[PDB]
Design an enzyme around this catalytic site. Sequence first.
Site, short mmCIF file in Angstrom:
data_model
loop_
_atom_site.label_atom_id
_atom_site.label_comp_id
_atom_site.label_asym_id
_atom_site.label_seq_id
_atom_site.Cartn_x
_atom_site.Cartn_y
_atom_site.Cartn_z
N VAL B 186 0.84 -1.20 0.00
CA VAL B 186 0.00 0.00 0.00
C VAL B 186 0.87 1.25 0.00
O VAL B 186 0.52 2.26 -0.62
CB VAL B 186 -0.99 0.02 1.18
N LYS B 187 2.01 1.22 0.70
CA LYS B 187 2.91 2.37 0.69
C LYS B 187 3.43 2.68 -0.71
O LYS B 187 3.75 3.84 -1.00
CB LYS B 187 4.08 2.13 1.64
N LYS B 188 3.51 1.68 -1.58
CA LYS B 188 3.95 1.89 -2.95
C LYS B 188 2.83 2.34 -3.89
O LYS B 188 3.08 2.49 -5.08
CB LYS B 188 4.59 0.60 -3.48
N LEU B 189 1.62 2.57 -3.38
CA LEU B 189 0.57 3.22 -4.15
C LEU B 189 0.75 4.74 -4.10
O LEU B 189 -0.05 5.49 -3.54
CB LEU B 189 -0.81 2.82 -3.62
N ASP B 190 1.85 5.18 -4.71
CA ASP B 190 2.25 6.57 -4.75
C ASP B 190 2.43 7.01 -6.20
O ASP B 190 2.70 6.20 -7.09
CB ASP B 190 3.56 6.78 -3.96
#
Lengths: 70, 698
Positions: B186-190
């Site tokens: 989810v942190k890489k949904l940037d």
Amino acid sequence: SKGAAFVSKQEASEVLKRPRRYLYQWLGAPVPYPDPLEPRREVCELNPDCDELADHIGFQEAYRRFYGPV
Amino acid sequence: DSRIGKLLGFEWTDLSSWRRLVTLLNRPTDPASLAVFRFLFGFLMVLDIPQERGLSSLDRKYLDGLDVCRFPLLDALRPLPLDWMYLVYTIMFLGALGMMLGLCYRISCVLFLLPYWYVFLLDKTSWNNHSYLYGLLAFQLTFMDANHYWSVDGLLNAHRRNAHVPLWNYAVLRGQIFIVYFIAGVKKLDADWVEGYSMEYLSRHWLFSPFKLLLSEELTSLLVVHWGGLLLDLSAGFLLFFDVSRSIGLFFVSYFHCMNSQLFSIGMFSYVMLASSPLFCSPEWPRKLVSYCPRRLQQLLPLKAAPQPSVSCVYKRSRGKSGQKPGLRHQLGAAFTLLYLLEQLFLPYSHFLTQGYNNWTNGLYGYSWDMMVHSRSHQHVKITYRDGRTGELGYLNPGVFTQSRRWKDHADMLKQYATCLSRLLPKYNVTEPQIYFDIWVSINDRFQQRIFDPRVDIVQAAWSPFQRTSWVQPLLMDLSPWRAKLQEIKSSLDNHTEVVFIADFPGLHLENFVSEDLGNTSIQLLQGEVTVELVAEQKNQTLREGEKMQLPAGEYHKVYTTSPSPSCYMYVYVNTTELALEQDLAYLQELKEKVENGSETGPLPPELQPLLEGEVKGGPEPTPLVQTFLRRQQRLQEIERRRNTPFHERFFRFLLRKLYVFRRSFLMTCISLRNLILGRPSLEQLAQEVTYANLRPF
Ligand SMILES: C/C(=C\Cc1c(C)c(O)c2ccccc2c1O)CCC[C@H](C)CCC[C@H](C)CCCC(C)C
Ligand SMILES: *[C@@H]1O[C@H](CO)[C@@H](O[C@@H]2O[C@H](CO)[C@@H](O)[C@H](O)[C@H]2NC(C)=O)[C@H](O)[C@H]1NC(C)=O
Ligand SMILES: *[C@@H]1O[C@H](CO)[C@@H](O[C@@H]2O[C@H](CO)[C@@H](O)[C@H](O)[C@H]2NC(C)=O)[C@H](O)[C@H]1NC(C)=O
Ligand SMILES: *[C@@H]1O[C@H](CO)[C@@H](O)[C@H](O)[C@H]1NC(C)=O
Ligand SMILES: *[C@@H]1O[C@H](CO)[C@@H](O)[C@H](O)[C@H]1NC(C)=O
């Protein structure tokens, strides 16, 4: 100019300088200039010396006091 | 019987009351997979201590008498002397060995846990996700009964030999790995990851060669490197749990971890994740594997018989006896599991409380699982100091009294560095100073821009952990789309010219000194309004959009921003001295090639004779051009020889280097333990031992 800590005005104010790079080499290899933070701390490939820690100010004197005349 | 019960392993009715939840979380389970993971984790930590924790290099990081600016989380914490540090690392090694062999398991886990976190909290610059994970795993394994199978403590105690363990030991580990995968996903949904900016250049590695057969590089750097990572994070979170999707998940995860091991230098993290992957299998896989061997191997491998009853589990009594009422350790285990998983979920998103640590990114790096999401690059760092007695203004070497370089990206580390400089400078004839910082940095290939206000005295600045810092410049996300156009400008240049893009706030100004070498330097304005001042004649010109000026070489100049909004411009420069040297070197190379191929029959000049001879013996010293040419030729030959190296030699050198590291660590530890116990001998003996320790194995 009183020791290695201080620098002159000219050398401090050069923005356009060729940077030596924390990772890989400015001379070669991919992704030297982008910074990945997570990878381990090591610097430009050279003789079997791992880190820049020996370049600190006063390293030689402290090392001689603690471990003698090596 | 129910499909939900089979898939999830528990029925809904088990969650109806607290007592049934405790019984579910303390059901019997086989210990084998936990024992295998304990052994592998102990082995990997044992291998990791002398390599990344820095035991080999610890003689040059905590050296006594050296004046260094530390970065501990709490200012109260300070390093001990070097000898006690080596004793601490020795205790760490003993704890790791005890965990690996399962001998005095609880004491071993404590001896590995307390020193590890002492070292971890001591320095914030050595923080990273795969050290935090090791700390958490050591914390969890301290409470788990992981010594019930294939452990020496079983041989020394009958009651703990091949016994059952409660389910929550497996549940906590599975939850930890799932949280790692899902939070990383989810942190890489940037915007910087889904668009191809972060890790844009990693597609050139030869490991991605087959993908280039069917896809172009530009797509290969987006579909495979970026989107593949996100999809694998989420799926490896979910697939491994269910029986249907375990095989494909294991295959993809193993491939992913092997490629991460080869591409990066993260260390033992890939192998730890590989060792943690099997835990989602059935708890008893080592036992069936041991069963599927000849009898001769079975005489050496662990036991295959069914495990015996234990006391740390709630046993359902089908004899007509009343069910065993849960005691205290079971309720504590259930509460520990629930609270620990909730805390692990909450902590990565706890950045709205500790706002003092917030920056262009969120919080300190290490406990957010945002791996390889942001890439930064620094251009210039200027540290100015004003003396408090005479009023003189001077400039410091940017990396003075420091060992890391994360202090250019965090306000708190900057404040600690400022205080360290304030205490240390009076040894160098400087009274109570005022220190100013000016740092330029760009994240993910944006305009290079200031990160701290260059007009604020950091020594007297205000900082608290739970309030926002008032001297951190905002990141301009309005200039993001320019990253398209700038890239085009990066492709329109020759092989010599170079470009640097700058964006500046209103009111501030940049003073610069173009060195004499960088002749033919120009400044162009892209957006906003600026005024360029030459101080040699005190002349200032106001530049509008799309105007270019030729700056002096070897003089000072200033750029002031005089618009309501930030102004973006660009320096385009060429290094003239390097160009002239290259032309002269090419001419000399042409002359020697003419000499070798038979042309240029006339006698060579005396300055060319050392080139043909190749050695300065019995003659005048060579000119700088000749020395540069010989050095370049020797370097090119050395590189060519390095490229032409067979694999076995490289492997042998790798093994010899690793053996050298291990030997040096062990010898230094023995020397200091002798110093602690029997006292410090004379200086000559110490020098002799230290010389012996550093000797290469050969
Ligand atoms: C470097 C990458 C992610 C950062 C990272 C690292 C280093 C880890 O150690 C992680 C460990 C656990 C969880 C997350 C981690 C993490 O985020 C992307 C690397 C991508 C890889 C090179 C692409 C090849 C594999 C893909 C998934 C194949 C898919 C094929 C498609 C056709 C479906
Ligand atoms: C000075 O540097 C400029 C860039 O700052 C270079 O200008 C190039 O000159 C050639 C001349 O044929 C043009 O084709 C290129 O388009 C120019 N580059 C640009 C506009 O970026 C050049 O190398 C240097 N010029 C002089 C006169 O010294
Ligand atoms: C050239 O123009 C610049 C544009 O600002 C002048 O900068 C101002 O300089 C005065 C003193 O000369 C300062 O009080 C102002 O604060 C400066 N402005 C800003 C925005 O910082 C500069 O002085 C001019 N130089 C000359 C020689 O006239
Ligand atoms: C200034 O510093 C130098 C270098 O450290 C030192 O020798 C000297 O004592 C100092 N001088 C004065 C006048 O305080
Ligand atoms: C420019 O080129 C010269 C060539 O000798 C080199 O020494 C120097 O480092 C380069 N950079 C600057 C800023 O002069």
